């Protein structure tokens, strides 16, 4: 025999029994450890010295050697999930006694008084009692039903050996059916000085809800209610794929869903199963499958499956390869008929995953886990800060929103790293400045957070889709005609898809924007993303270009499928006059292939009614006539230089910092003189005037008209009538 | 599979011996494993199945001994059937990859064992492969696997049949679906494999479960059952896998949809009616068939949807192959694809192959092109009329620019027929406008559908459709839904849009037609 | 090295957990291990070091067992220091090459062990690499190795300080040299690295030895001591190798020299 490690098992039959020191171990194992069963036992979980000293008993020979029962209370206290390997060791010396013992009454407002009715007898009547941590069910106490759990962390007992994981204590009662100087004191949470493992809960995860309810349903349906699905006879699914950018907390989500689930959970360490002789890996995987199927409820986790199961066509290294893929797919396909078994595979990129795995027979379910948005980041920040508590920080909601708005390209791990190094910066700014002053007063502020974001150096800037910053209509300076037209072409689809279906008109799904490169194109695109508030994917021209041939095809296919599967949305191109010109620019075959692929996607044997495709260009005639075909990109907006009203509004917005009354500017003569300029030109002129004003006598509360006129002399118009006439003749010919 | 087992003596009396190897090939998810399972279930004789990679072992002789023992067991029991799963993995190509170890040695011993295992017996070997090309040519020789079974992607009829059969298993109690909904689903699901349909049904049931739990607060799941509401989202989020294929079939479109010129319709009707009911006449006379028709015209209409109209009218499978999609980054992949499509067309009865565009692959001298394009063009020229002549299949080519076809392809004896297929005439545009305005009410608007066509003469059919679409949009943007489109909206849209067609290209097309 | 170890309770009060990784990177001559030696010699806490390829074994599980054993031993003693040298070779980039054997398996097991040794504790892992680009991006992640320090080539000020400290070890009794000569040498030394400065010192010592020998027939070394000429000879004959650089510290010039 010689069993080295053991797998945990929940204690059945509930009731009371012993409930703390069950330890239904095989008698052969009891004799092999050279200790009488009527004593303490220890469970290891690959390390964690102290080894959770708990008393032991004997089973009825029904319990097999491999599995061990140690009660759900201890399972939760030690955060012992199913499938982990527990080590057995000799017992430790008896602790002297318990000093204080204090209840916590978690998830409750406490002050129960009458409802208590001597809970001390029920709590301390059990043998064992690992003093710092227990949880118990509410059971049936008087009237008023409901459920509560208590926290038993608080104590004032000192133990000489620090090796013990949680320094259990003894018991001594005086009663029937008085502790040591009362036990009820405060409703404190788990004490931090014990350094006990924190059980993951769904309240920690933020910004991942919209798919977390789907994941919860997909996990609950087979494991909890399989009879209803089996009655249909379509068989229950066994595999769900989780994919997305790194740092999205895939492993944390797996851990928390394992902790919440009370059924058997199985996980692998990843690539370390790979061994020699090409048979040990097969034996290990078949043993894991046999163990999962042996117990009726079970869940299996697969981590970095891409390394385990790479694409067959991509590489042919050998050893652990498609053979194990075949054996695992055969095992999963016919493992059972109804059952209750789910296998979750986590991969960094779905493309590298073997397409055999990405089949309806095995992994028909796909879950999209993208980067957090502004709202998700807001919730993620509020969530950590809410858990953080105001005793260690002073930052209100508006500061959190401002930080979340500034944070765009970060990922879930990036925010945690930023918070950690913000704490680092706060500690440095306290110590090195005030010479070891109390850190409670300084705590967390906004300046250290800003400096921390300056020095964080994020590494997730390169993204296939970018959330371009929003801006409301108040800051927008433009003509009413273009705004009304754009509002019309965005009002038609969303609330007129049914009208289009009834009438058969459908939607053009194509709008082309051409104009001067000064302003309005991207500004109108921004207003459209803020105003409507619908999904927006900012795509630039040169960024889709890739040196590798075919990578751009994969990128455009991925963005198109994301737009299709991410509800109705709008796709905007910042600069479309780069990929389009191929005949004039003598572009390579890659550009022609991209053009053909995008044409086939927009108007080839398929229709995208939900999404709307809009493009902006600087030189309109260089776009190939194939794109300028009826039915695609038919809409044309001149959107030329801004009029006097838009320039006046932009100047008023830019001058808001300065005082116009002191300067004496009427805000109308400046606009009258500034006619041929653009919005960007107006902004640059205002910036130069402000610079000239502030270089005279340092800080100034206003900008003088002489500085503005000097800037007017010192700048060039930057616009030529020849290109204006070119745009006009393009408009006339279209 | 019944002729070797049930009646071996009848076939052996001829002395040619019955075949022993049947090959099943097709796209993944078609159901080769289903055929294997159903023949295993329905046959009362002994069968032998393989575990694939499990037989493969480190020892070189272990696999040989296992295969020899399997064959000895199969031959010991006089009725036996051999099943092979993923023969391509077990038997890769020597030319493509020299992996070593467990390789074509097993191929040689397998062919040696199965060539002379028995004289008559009753033994049949069924092997299913995902792709036939990767299989080594040794296995793909008439000596062992002459008999082949082709299982392509289901068409509209097969998809309708499987959905009708799929729904029956669930039954009417579990879901209220009628024939019209099944037909609509089959029409919508064009490029979907059989596995994709069952997955769509399963996740439709899933969507039903989530909807019921969210709305009805844990009501009995039988009350909500299955409707089309979740099926719509099912097609929305199915994430298909069969989009990339060379067997794209356009939906059937009847004659009433197309408004064109009767001369071109009569010409193409004669061209299609000549082979099908005049093959014997051609054989008697020796004329055969031109097997080539060229469609060159303005980038308008009547030259692309005419293929769909032809497919609908003739009721014959068509090969709607797009031009640019055959181009591949890998060198020689386009040659593989075109040879495969030619083989499929030859194997799929006399049919008509339609090319969406040819003005891109054909130009090799007028514009700079890679050597791969020239090689593909030469292969196409050799296939169409080079040494090999195909009788049943008919090839029709459609192009947007005629001068891009080189004189090598534009040679007498192939692609002889030329169709101007110019802009639609007054009657065609009038019919298109009437069909477009059928949804609207012409009597309320007061238009006679004739003056609009008189003013709209320089436009095209697609241009007319877009004009009607934007006119309807202008009519509806005022007070949301409307019962008609007014003439003022028509004329405003007439200002808004432009034909974009110049007389110079029409003159160029006429000049090209004169020289042909 | 002091914040997460000296006061673990104060940091654990926040509950954000302390970082478990220090990354040293830059060109050779940056005093990488020297820093590792300095902290180990100075800090009284227990330190653990690895030999690199010695841990690497042909067996699949021996490396895993050794890593687990050393991590458990470090966790057993409350004050612990972890040394990880040539981490780039120990943990090669997954995308650069799929060499196998010692590969992503050990990376995953080490990150798992250094991600969950305890709640707060006091454990620090120091990794030194010659180039961060060759480091596996899994290692270069904010989850495990967010804290890094950049070490670059010394500038005119830094190079002069290194040269002065090196000379201050021999002392005046050994040699006589003014600060002006040291500043001139530091200004002349532009593309050299930290190890190159000691190479120049050793070459100057050599040149002095052979010059004194061949000149005065094994005279006492104290009389000749160290001068400039052997130093310039060492610079001439040292064959500098770190001349290539992404950024160039061109010698400075003042407005007095400016004619404009
Ligand atoms: N007030 C502002 N502050 C900062 N950036 C701005 C402001 N207004 C516009 N921008 C930026 O200037 C860009 C203007 O683009 P634009 O010149 O209209 O594109 P195009 O050159 O195609 O016409 C926008 O992308 C926007 O991000
Ligand atoms: N009356 C119509 N209603 C709707 N669609 C049409 C109509 N007439 C033509 N079409 C569509 O317009 C397309 C015309 O293609 P075409 O522009 O001639 O190809 P190419 O760009 O190669 O010249 C056809 O694919 C057809 O589906």
Numbering used by the authors:
A (entry chain E): 29 to 205, 220 to 776
B (entry chain D): 261 to 776
C (entry chain F): 261 to 520
What text comes from the article?
The type II AAA + ATPase Drg1 is a ribosome assembly factor, functioning to release Rlp24 from the pre-60S particle just exported from nucleus, and its activity in can be inhibited by a drug molecule diazaborine. Here, we report Drg1 structures in different nucleotide-binding and benzo-diazaborine treated states. All structures display a typical three-layered architecture, similar to those of type II AAA + hexamers, such as p97/VCP and Cdc48, and the NTD, D1, and D2 rings show an apparent deviation from a perfect sixfold symmetry. Comparisons of these structures indicate that Drg1 hexamers transit between two extreme conformations, a planar and a helical state.
To obtain possible hybrid nucleotide bound states that best mimic the ATPase hydrolysis cycle of Drg1 and to illustrate the inhibition mechanism of benzo-diazaborine, we also incubated Drg1 with a mixture of ADP, AMPPNP, and benzo-diazaborine, as well as with a mixture of ATP and benzo-diazaborine. Taking the dataset of ADP/AMPPNP/benzo-diazaborine as an example, we performed deep 3D classification and analyzed the conformational differences between its planar and helical states. While the NTD and D1 rings are roughly superimposable, the D2 rings display a very large rotation between two states. While the six subunits in the planar or planar-like states are arranged more symmetrically, the subunits in the helical states adopt a spiral configuration to varying extents. Benzo-diazaborine was detected in the six D1 ATPase sites of the planar state, which is more symmetrical, whereas all the ATPase sites in the helical hexamer show no trace of benzo-diazaborine. Therefore, it is apparent that the treatment of Drg1 hexamers with benzo-diazaborine led to the formation of more symmetrical structures, indicating that the chemical also directly modulates the conformation of Drg1 hexamer, in addition to the inhibition of the ATP hydrolysis. The nucleotide binding to the D2 domains was only seen in structures from benzo-diazaborine treated samples, including the ADP/AMPPNP/benzo-diazaborine and ATP/benzo-diazaborine datasets. While the six D2 ATPase sites in the structure of the ATP/benzo-diazaborine dataset are fully occupied by ATP, the six D2 sites in the structures from the ADP/AMPPNP/benzo-diazaborine dataset are not saturated and appear to be partially occupied by ADP. In sharp contrast, in the protomer of planar benzo-diazaborine bound hexamer, the linker is in a loop conformation. Especially, M503 in the loop conformation is released from the hydrophobic interface.
